[PDB]
């Protein structure tokens, strides 16, 4: 059932060939959103900025253990909503008027200053002060630096426009600006970095015009260097094998009948007589050349995933075995074979030529621990003046291909003995001659047969043009830091003798039709899918104490869920398939530990974590803007503090010192009727638990009968929203006094009141102006059409 992932990889590469033009690195125009404040004025030279609920989410914590969790929930949900409005947008647009032969350019961003006349009921003495405010709203330019040390240090221009509104709005926009302009850079620095990274001079990056040099762009938080690719070593072998397999769909083998005819011609024996060499290659099949080619290439890349041969024989021999071992010895380079396989074939060769030795004794006397010395000794004996047998070998290759990539490359061996010319290269000498014949429990081979077999394993020299393109297009797309990885799945480095012998005799090489950009486009995808999980771990799970390495297996189900979810979306199918296919050899625990180490070495968590941390204190500071209040107070015969009477006619604000407080709600809700009566009889009481309240500010014209503060059904139970009422004291009616009749008529005996309430008063209209920053697109415009190489000029 291993073929279910074959089509998965094929479809992954096919969908990779799709363009899928993401709109990253490219920004867009944006404007600041407008909140509501609903200000008014009770008398001369005093202006009240009433707070109005902005966002109405957040649910109370039923466990009641903590208070900070409520604020954290509010902040996180609010900024999750906010971050969706500035995904790839910078604040640039603002509502100017003009700058033409009158005073300089002035700004009208907040609510129009003309509208304040009918809202504040200004008199003639103050309306004259309005035009000067409008004409004093000049725009100031400045500079700000962007970029880190790893990137380039650049400078962008900014503006500081004035607008009318509340200070809370000013702080909100300051936070939005700080969050929205992280990891910004200019094109002239990105181009320099890209040129520095591409050392080769064949690549020519498009030259920048004068107008595009100061344009602004967005860059990733941290670059992908060789360090990230180094830490993926423990699982790299699987990726290398499956990258070779998915891109090598052909093999250049000459048909077996042709080699059979060649060998028959080269043979020095009569046709009718029997020679075992010609009767051993007749029963050979080349159906599985492709798999052996993939394994050959993998052994060429990694120096530790050496190919190991499986021998069907145990102690005795067979006519086929001797000829197949000779073919392997003469045709497969020694650097791509493991020590055990080399020693085995060397012993098989040496048994026949030895004076007295056999096969069983040479295996039984030796041990597998130190077979390298035995192999070297046998090779030295076979390379003497009495016997000479050329051993196939190969050299390294430094050549590469011009392409854009972010990692270095290294030399690899070649899966064929060719040395860039038709003539192969051996290890000892390119001559074949023997002192005597070959015999081993029978199976006589004449001296001339070996020489004849030498001339049939040659490469035709004509396919060398196609034999290297796959190869050079193989030393140009694999990172050099993966060449020291171990092996996790053993069967990827195993092949039976007959298949290897057929591959060697047939003179087959890997071939492909895909280009070079396709493979680097997949390696980049793998790196990105690792980096996403690393960043999520760093921004969610990184915590030193509190269930570190010494935690029970029970928590692993909780830990693994986020990683699985991140692995579950589109574009990560390669890593997900590789993970779920080879879970047996690579358990999830080691993968999780490796990812934790990657994220802990160094990684920017996310721009949003610090932002949420900064918003939490804001949520702490101003409760009314978020529609919540703690410590409500219940009492009869309340006493007003007379400090807020200067702004409101009737208000729910009192100053009673509490006595005998209740721990939290849902407790007073069910004690007993006529039992809680004593609690309020001894004095005012307080309910600690925070609530979800909304203030209603009403003019002195109507009433809103909430009347649901206390519901009387066999118990004095509280409500769940506790809407209050305020009546504004306006200039229209501020000398008359209200009888306070229509404030307890819609109430009950017991009154629900509030202890603390915060509002901002202003003495002069000049304090109604605040500041926001912008981008000033005129001098540092938003960029378009990112940096590209030059080709298809027309």
């Amino acid at each position: 059932l291993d073929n279910v992932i074959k089509q998965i990889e094929a479809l992954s590469v096919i969908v990779n060939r799709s363009e899928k033009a993401d709109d990253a690195q490219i920004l867009g125009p944006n404007t600041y959103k407008q909140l509501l404040e609903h200000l008014f004025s009770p008398e001369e030279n005093v202006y009240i900025l009433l707070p109005i609920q902005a966002y109405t989410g957040g649910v109370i914590d039923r466990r009641d253990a903590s208070f900070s969790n409520f604020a954290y929930s509010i902040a996180s949900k609010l900024m999750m909503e906010l971050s969706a409005a500035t995904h790839n947008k910078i604040f640039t647009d603002y509502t100017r008027i003009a700058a033409s032969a009158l005073g300089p350019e002035i700004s009208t961003e907040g609510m129009p200053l003309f509208s304040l006349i009918e809202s504040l009921e200004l008199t003639e003495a103050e309306t004259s002060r309005l035009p000067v405010i409008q004409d004093s709203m000049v725009i100031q330019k400045s500079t700000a630096t962007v970029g880190n040390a790893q990137q380039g240090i650049s400078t962008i221009n900014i503006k500081r426009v004035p607008f009318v509104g509340s200070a809370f709005q000013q702080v909100i926009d300051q936070l939005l600006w700080e969050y929205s302009t992280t990891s910004l850079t200019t094109k002239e620095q990105r181009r320099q970095r890209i040129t520095e990274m591409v050392n080769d001079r064949r690549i020519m990056i498009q030259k920048l015009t004068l107008a595009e040099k100061p344009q602004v762009m967005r860059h990733v938080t941290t670059e992908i260097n060789n360090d990230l690719f180094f830490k993926m070593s423990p699982v790299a072998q699987l990726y290398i094998y499956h990258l070779d397999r998915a891109f090598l769909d052909g093999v250049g083998f000459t048909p077996l009948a042709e080699k059979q005819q060649q060998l028959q011609l080269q043979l020095k024996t009569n046709i009718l007589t029997a020679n075992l060499i010609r009767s051993a290659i007749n029963g050979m099949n080349t159906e599985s050349n492709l798999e052996v080619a993939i394994k050959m290439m993998q052994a060429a890349q990694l120096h530790r995933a050496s190919i190991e041969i499986a021998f069907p024989m145990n102690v005795s021999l067979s006519p086929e075995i001797i000829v197949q071992c000779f073919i392997v010895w003469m045709s497969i380079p020694e650097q791509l074979l493991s020590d055990r396989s080399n020693f085995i074939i060397a012993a098989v060769i040496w048994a026949g030529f030895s004076a007295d030795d056999s096969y069983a004794d040479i295996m039984r006397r030796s041990a597998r621990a130190s077979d390298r010395q035995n192999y070297d000794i046998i090779k030295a004996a076979l390379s003497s003046r009495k016997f000479k047998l050329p051993r196939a070998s190969t050299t390294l290759f430094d050549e590469n291909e011009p392409v854009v990539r972010r990692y270095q490359i290294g030399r690899v061996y070649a899966p064929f003995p060719v040395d860039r010319y038709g003539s192969p290269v051996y290890s000892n000498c390119t001559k074949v001659e023997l002192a005597s014949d070959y015999n081993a429990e029978g199976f006589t081979i004449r001296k001339d047969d070996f020489r004849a077999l030498q001339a049939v394993l040659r490469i035709d020299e004509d396919r060398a043009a196609d034999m290297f393109t796959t190869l050079r297009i193989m030393i140009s797309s694999i990172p050099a830091v993966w060449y020291d990885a171990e092996v996790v799945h053993y069967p990827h480095t195993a092949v039976e003798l007959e298949q290897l012998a057929a591959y060697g005799l047939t003179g087959a090489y890997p071939r492909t039709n895909h280009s070079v950009d396709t493979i680097v486009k997949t390696v980049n995808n793998i790196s990105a899918t690792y980096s996403t999980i690393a960043q999520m771990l760093s921004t969610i799970d990184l915590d030193p104490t509190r269930y570190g390495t010494s935690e029970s297996i029970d928590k692993f189900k909780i830990a693994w869920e986020n990683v699985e979810s991140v692995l579950n979306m589109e574009g990560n199918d390669f890593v997900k398939t590789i993970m779920y296919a080879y879970e047996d050899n690579f358990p999830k625990k080691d993968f999780y530990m490796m990812l934790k180490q990657i994220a802990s070495d160094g990684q920017g968590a996310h721009p949003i974590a610090a932002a949420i941390d900064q918003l939490r204190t804001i949520v702490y500071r101003e409760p009314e803007r978020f529609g919540y209040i703690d410590s409500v107070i219940l009492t009869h015969n309340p006493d007003v503090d007379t400090a807020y009477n200067r702004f409101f006619h009737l208000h729910p604000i009192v100053t009673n010192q509490p006595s005998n407080t209740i721990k939290n709600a849902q407790l007073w809700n069910e004690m007993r009727l006529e039992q809680q009566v004593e609690h309020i009889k001894a004095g005012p009481v307080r309910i600690i638990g925070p609530f979800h309240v909304t203030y209603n500010y009403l003019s002195e014209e109507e009433d809103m009968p909430a009347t649901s503060h206390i519901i009387m059904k066999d118990n004095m139970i509280l409500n769940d929203h506790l809407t209050f009422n305020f009546v504004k004291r306006e200039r229209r009616n501020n000398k008359k006094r209200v009888s306070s009749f229509r404030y307890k008529a819609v109430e009950m005996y017991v009154a629900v009141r509030i202890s603390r309430f915060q509002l901002e008063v202003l003495r002069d209209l000049h304090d109604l102006v605040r500041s926001r920053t912008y981008l000033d697109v005129s001098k540092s415009p938003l960029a378009t059409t990112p940096i590209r190489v030059v080709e298809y000029v027309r």
Binding site: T539, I540, D541, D543, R546, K555, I558, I608
Partner: protein
């Protein structure tokens, strides 16, 4: 290093706490034990001495 970097550990602790507090209030009803019988015999072949 911020309050967001502790969410997973907090969720682990909360899950353990809710498991404990659900186990505390669960009603216990001792089940009557049945199906007790001597039906675990051993087979084999006799020795059947010759003579």
């Amino acid at each position: 290093m911020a309050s967001t970097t502790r969410l997973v550990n907090d969720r682990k602790q909360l899950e353990q706490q809710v498991k404990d507090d659900a186990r505390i209030l669960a009603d216990a009803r001792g089940l009557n034990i049945t199906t007790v019988a001597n039906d675990s015999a051993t087979g084999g072949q006799a020795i059947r001495n010759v003579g």
